[PDB]
Amino acid sequence: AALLQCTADTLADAVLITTAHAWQHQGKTLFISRKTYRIDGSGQMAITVDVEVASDTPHPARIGLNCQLAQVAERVNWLGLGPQENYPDRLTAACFDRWDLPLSDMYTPYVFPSENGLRCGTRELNYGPHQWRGDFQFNISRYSQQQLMETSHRHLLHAEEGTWLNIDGFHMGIGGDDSWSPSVSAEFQLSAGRYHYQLVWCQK
Amino acid sequence: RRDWENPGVTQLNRLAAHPPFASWRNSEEARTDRPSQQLRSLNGEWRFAWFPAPEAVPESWLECDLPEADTVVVPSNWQMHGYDAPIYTNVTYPITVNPPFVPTENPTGCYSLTFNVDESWLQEGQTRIIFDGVNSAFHLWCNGRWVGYGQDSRLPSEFDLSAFLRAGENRLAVMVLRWSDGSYLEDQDMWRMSGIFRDVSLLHKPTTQISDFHVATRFNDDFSRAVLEAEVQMCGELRDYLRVTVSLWQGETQVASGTAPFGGEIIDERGGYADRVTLRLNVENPKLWSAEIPNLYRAVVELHTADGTLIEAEACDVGFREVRIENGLLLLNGKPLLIRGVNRHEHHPLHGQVMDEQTMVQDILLMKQNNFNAVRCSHYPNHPLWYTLCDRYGLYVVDEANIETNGMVPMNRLTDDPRWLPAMSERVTRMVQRDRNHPSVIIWSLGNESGHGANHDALYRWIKSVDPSRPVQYEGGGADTTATDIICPMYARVDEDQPFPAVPKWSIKKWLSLPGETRPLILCEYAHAMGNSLGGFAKYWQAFRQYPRLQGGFVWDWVDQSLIKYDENGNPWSAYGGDFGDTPNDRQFCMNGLVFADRTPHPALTEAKHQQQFFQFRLSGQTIEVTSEYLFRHSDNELLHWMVALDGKPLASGEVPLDVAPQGKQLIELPELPQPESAGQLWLTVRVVQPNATAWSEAGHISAWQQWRLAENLSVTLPAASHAIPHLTTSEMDFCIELGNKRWQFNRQSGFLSQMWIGDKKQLLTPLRDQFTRAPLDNDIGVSEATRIDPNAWVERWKAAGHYQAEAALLQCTADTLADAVLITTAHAWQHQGKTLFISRKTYRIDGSGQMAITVDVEVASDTPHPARIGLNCQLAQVAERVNWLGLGPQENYPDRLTAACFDRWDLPLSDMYTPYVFPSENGLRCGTRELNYGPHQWRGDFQFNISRYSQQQLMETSHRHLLHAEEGTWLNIDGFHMGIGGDDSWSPSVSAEFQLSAGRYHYQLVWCQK
Ligand SMILES: CC(C)S[C@@H]1O[C@H](CO)[C@H](O)[C@H](O)[C@H]1O
Ligand SMILES: CC(C)S[C@@H]1O[C@H](CO)[C@H](O)[C@H](O)[C@H]1O
Ligand SMILES: [Mg+2]
Ligand SMILES: [Mg+2]
Ligand SMILES: [Mg+2]
Ligand code: NA
Ligand code: NA
Ligand code: NA
Ligand code: NA
Ligand code: NA
Ligand code: NA
């Protein structure tokens, strides 16, 4: 990320932080992310994200945010598609309802490790003291995308401190018509160019 | 007798049908197709009188001109002369259904003519008169004596007047009935008119004459050899001395000829035809006819004596082509066709159903220029000249019998009834007898919308037996009956099934593979172009290209059937059903064309041209792959032009000669490119241009195009620090923002931007407000009507849900001053009867730069019908001359109808941003727009827009374009999203799901900045 702008403003009943970032590679701008974080008197933080993706870069795997939480809670509760892992082109079996599972169940132990455990069409997610609201897809677990990507076998995965949360506005299909040539269908590729999403983060 | 109320009598004393004759008495004239002194036109001024019923016609009329008659032009439709009203009804018959009777009040046209006949014509030979088209039935008298009667409004009726004429002056009397039992088989969806509407002529033939002739052409496997066979029949006295000679010419060169006395081969135990003979000519490497290269030869048939004295000659254009269905595919000269067709009715806004050469030529040229290669004579045999033009300019034709009994219950009531077979049979047989020698006719059709009856099966088999050279098709009864060689549905969808009982309309892709099915599929009608339509057109093309057995289709239809009427100011205006007092009527359903009545294009036309292109393209790095869809010709009148532009700014362009074989490819390597000196999206646009003029196109004609996005450079450079900061003034009723000479006012009671100033000049006539509806298109209304609502129609869903009546309730309106800007926040709910339909949350950020940034986030209740659009609208105080945008264009384009439009910088007069559909509706949208300029205003973002002098309200309350009146200022509709327009049909919801606004949550943002 290359910071482009970072400002803070005081509102009648809130504080407004505006940011803008660029991700580049060898001088090419791949993505631009513009956000606002509005913190009001109720303790709620409303994050608005507007992203641009260069039309000529390969459509990205996802459009979201991530962070490592200090908290390690026992359960995961959400209002969205479940209870099992589901992806945009693999979610017809999942039902929209209130789901509550132990944390470990939010991780799928594929022998060869990868991105996993996403849940789509979620409107509310609760973990420990935290609560996220909006319309997003998410995964939660003790393994970072970095570790998963670097470990060839599930038995060698190690829980990291805390919990990794990947909350996405958009996520690419997983495909599978075959596993030797690109199989994700156009309609599940993130090729819109401009994407918008919003999340509210709060406590309890 | 009341012959017009008896389907057992369709003519009295009428001569047999045959192919076009001219009775030349000079071979060279026949060869060159020059006018024949033996074929005279009687078109021109005639005498005419109108009566309410046949019983009111005075007998004196038979021998003497009625003083009260008028002199009028013939051919003509009398309704077009104001004698009575033309009637527009679609399915329901214009008369009480009570076959075979017609109303007692039956408008009767009494036509007459006094003309001269040369003595030479009567000293020898036979003089007949020919009525190419009389609607719907008539009796004929000559010199006061009764001659005969005829039915079938769309085929010539011929009568021998040899015994009735005298040298010098003679008087014809023709009593034309508007309604007859033939009207039961004439229920096509078009204006119901009457009169002597096709040519009238006199033909002189010798007593001993060529009475008929049939030309057939067969070939070897690869079409490098052919055999032309001509069967010729004679009437008159057989003499051993008679001979027939058939010669074939290519240009001025005679390539083959054969001569024989009459006397055909043995046919059965009783012998053969002594009055016939068939000549067979070999043709090596014939030049084949196709719509791509309509090569023609001339066959001349001479009847003469052995000593060589000519008796008479006939002749026709011959096109060497084979039509056959094999292994499921319709082949032409052994290659599979891809029909880029259109249905075309014979319609003229001024002249009604009378057709003229100039109009026909204009139609053919526009069709070809727009990539059509075929036409269906919906739904009757056409004026004879039509076939000659299609043979010479090159179009595949479906010739269709004049049989349509749509308004019967059930549809096949008459067609399954044997008492109706005879009337039906002549409508089929007489067509074939007349048109079987035209190369352009490649398929025969049994008629239209008359269910499926046993009569159809009989006639299907008759044609197969008499003319094996052309497939036979018929859609009635489910489009795949035993009476069709082609699955030829009307309005079947690409992917969606419509499982109607008894006559389902399956998805075309699914239809081909039904168990046991093997035929090709070509839609007889699809993409109903009524008003703002052709949404989903590209969907059909993609499928036709991917499935071999999907061989295309015929769009419905070519031209709007509107008629001219004149206002109080004598200003002509376009009229539709009901405008002539006709009732019941089908209102705007008579207007479904790609072009307006005067042949001006509707926007859908370009979508069709683009989808029907004959060259396909692919882009790989710097290589462009061009593939030809021509089956027979090389691209020998084509060059490729390419242009690279950065956000509309030209950067580079070139041309490359195209040399592609039919169905071949060519790879063109593009030049290394300079770099764009700045941020933006680079786009590549290519076009195929024909440098040379052709018989149907001008030099420089653009036949195909395509664009792609190349590199894009995202803008990351921060603008410049503005040195001014806007100021907010708060009052009880408003929030006002001032930035030097500019001001913006937000009303606190409404929650909207109510006024804007540049100096002291107010910019708005109406506040900027959200808009979620549109003035309904014809496809949104479908067959719904006030007196009979169709609750499933989109318009009725929206109406019932209150979308049109919804009122905005303000939820919130606040003002915040930022460091360098003022921030207005609002929220509104649109409710109806207690239900919240939509919620709009917005922010307006105004900074030192004078730009107003608007963000919009809308929630739409999942249970309310998906809205027509999600946008804003306002009435601007300014009226400017031009409209300039960076987006899709230049013509009107919608989400499901935008493939033809290209992304570039466009600039047009404001009036061209309005599409004048006869029945007004939302129109003129342009999509994928990043910048819009109008007067001192500039809007940037990624939206769809329309701009004009008419509000959506006016458009929806005005039923005829001529009654529209420019409002003050300019109405601007800017949409973050807009629903598709549909058009698979105009009677049931046809907007595909992917083009419906069903996301639930929508986000868009715009920046408005001015001078
Ligand atoms: C309105 C439908 C019930 S019938 C529909 O009407 C159309 C109107 O242009 C065309 O005439 C079609 O051929 C006919 O099938
Ligand atoms: C004579 C050519 C047009 S086709 C010619 O017809 C022959 C029968 O006459 C045979 O069928 C040959 O195989 C065929 O090539
Ligand atoms: Mg009759
Ligand atoms: Mg009909
Ligand atoms: Mg395109
Ligand atoms: Na891995
Ligand atoms: Na095909
Ligand atoms: Na009506
Ligand atoms: Na119609
Ligand atoms: Na060329
Ligand atoms: Na209207």
DSSP line for B558-601: SB---EEEE-TT--EEEE-TTTTS-SS--GGGG---SB-TTSPB
Last residue within a domain, chosen from B572, B592, B612: B612
Peptide bond into B379 cis (omega under 30): yes
Residues with Cβ within 8 Å of A44's Cβ and at least 6 positions away in sequence, in order, are: A200, A201, A202
Last residue within a domain, chosen from B321, B345, B377: B321
Of the partner residues A7, A56, A194, the one whose CB lies closest to the CB of residue B711: A56
Judge if B233 and B115 occupy the same domain: no
Contact, B356 vs B348, CB < 8 A? Answer: yes
DSSP letter at B285 equals S
Q: How many residues does chain A have?
A: 204
Residues with Cβ within 8 Å of B281's Cβ and at least 6 positions away in sequence, in order, are: B227, B228, B229, B230, B246, B248, B256, B257, B258
Judge if B793 and B710 occupy the same domain: no
Judge if B82 and B225 occupy the same domain: no
The CA distance from A21 to A4, in Å, is 5
Q: Which amino acid is residue B596, in one-letter code?
A: F
Judge if B71 and B218 occupy the same domain: no
Q: Is B218 in the pocket of ligand 2 (CB under 6 A)?
A: yes
Indicate the top mutation candidate among B380, B792, B987 to test ligand 1's pocket, ranked by most ligand atoms within 8 A of CB: B987
Beta bridge partners of B641: B655, B687
> A119-130 in b/e burial notation, b at 16+ Cβ within 10 A?
bbbbebbbbbee
With an 8 Å Cβ cutoff, is B859 touching chain A? Answer: no
Judge if B193 and B212 occupy the same domain: no
Judge if B691 and B642 occupy the same domain: yes
Judge if B317 and B389 occupy the same domain: no
How far is CA B85 from its chain centroid?
A: 25
Indicate the top mutation candidate among B217, B227, B248 to test ligand 2's pocket, ranked by most ligand atoms within 8 A of CB: B227
Q: Which of B266, B270, B341, B277 is nearest to B303 (CA)?
A: B277
CB contact under 8 A, A22 and B942: no
Q: Which of B215, B170, B183 is nearest to B65 (CA)?
A: B170
Residue that is written with structure tokens 């929806």 in the block:
B956
Last residue within a domain, chosen from B688, B718, B748: B718
Active site annotation includes B449: yes
The CA distance from B880 to B972, in Å, is 12
How far is CA B471 from its chain centroid?
A: 23
Beta bridge partners of B45: B73
- Taking the CB of residue B586, how many other CB atoms lie within 10 A of it? 18
Question: Which one of the listed residues B525, B892, B922, B931 is annotated catalytic?
Answer: B525
Question: Resolution in A for the shown PDB structure?
Answer: 1.8
Of the partner residues B718, B816, B1003, the one whose CB lies closest to the CB of residue A4: B718
Judge if B178 and B306 occupy the same domain: no
DSSP H or E stretch at residue B659: none
Q: What's the structural domain count of chain B? A: 5
Residue A24, by phi and psi: left (phi above 0), alpha (psi -120 to 50) or beta? beta
Of the partner residues B710, B711, B816, the one whose CB lies closest to the CB of residue A12: B816
Indicate the top mutation candidate among B188, B189, B406 to test ligand 1's pocket, ranked by most ligand atoms within 8 A of CB: B189
DSSP line for B292-339: SSB--EEEEEEEEETT--EEEEEEEEE-B--EEEETTEEEETTEE--E
Judge if B578 and B434 occupy the same domain: yes
Question: Which of A5, A11, A25, A35 should we substitute to test contact with B (largest number of B Cβ atoms within 10 Å)?
Answer: A11
What experimental approach yielded this model? X-ray
Residue nearest ligand 1's atom 2 by CA: B987
- Write out chain B residues lying below 8 Å of A7, CB-based: 819
The CA distance from B77 to B705, in Å, is 43
Chain B nearest-CA distance from A34, in A, is: 11
Judge if B91 and B168 occupy the same domain: yes
DSSP letter at B676 equals P
Question: Which of B682, B712, B822 should we substitute to test contact with A (largest number of A Cβ atoms within 10 Å)?
Answer: B712
CA–centroid distance, residue B594 to ligand 5 (Å)? 20
Residues with Cβ within 8 Å of B475's Cβ and at least 6 positions away in sequence, in order, are: B448, B449, B484, B488, B489, B490, B524, B525
CB contact under 8 A, B718 and A194: no
Contact, B1011 vs B1003, CB < 8 A? Answer: no
Judge if B295 and B358 occupy the same domain: no
- Atom number, ligand 1, closest to the C-alpha of residue B90: 11
CATH code for the domain in which residue A203 is found: 2.70.98.10
The CA distance from B324 to B330, in Å, is 6
Residues with Cβ within 8 Å of B1001's Cβ and at least 6 positions away in sequence, in order, are: A135, B857, B858, B859, B860
Residue B850, by phi and psi: left (phi above 0), alpha (psi -120 to 50) or beta? left
Residue nearest ligand 2's atom 7 by CA: B220
Residue that is written with structure tokens 């590199």 in the block:
B711
CA–centroid distance, residue B461 to ligand 1 (Å)? 28
CA–centroid distance, residue A110 to ligand 6 (Å)? 9
Residues with Cβ within 8 Å of B333's Cβ and at least 6 positions away in sequence, in order, are: B223, B288, B290, B321, B322, B631, B632
Judge if B328 and B440 occupy the same domain: yes
- DSSP-based three-state secondary structure for A169: strand
B562-565 LR contacts (CB < 8 Å, sep 24+): B562/B349, B562/B590, B562/B591, B562/B596, B562/B597, B562/B918, B563/B86, B563/B191, B563/B349, B563/B352, B563/B597, B564/B349, B564/B350, B564/B597
**B762 is in which domain, residue-wise?**
719-1011
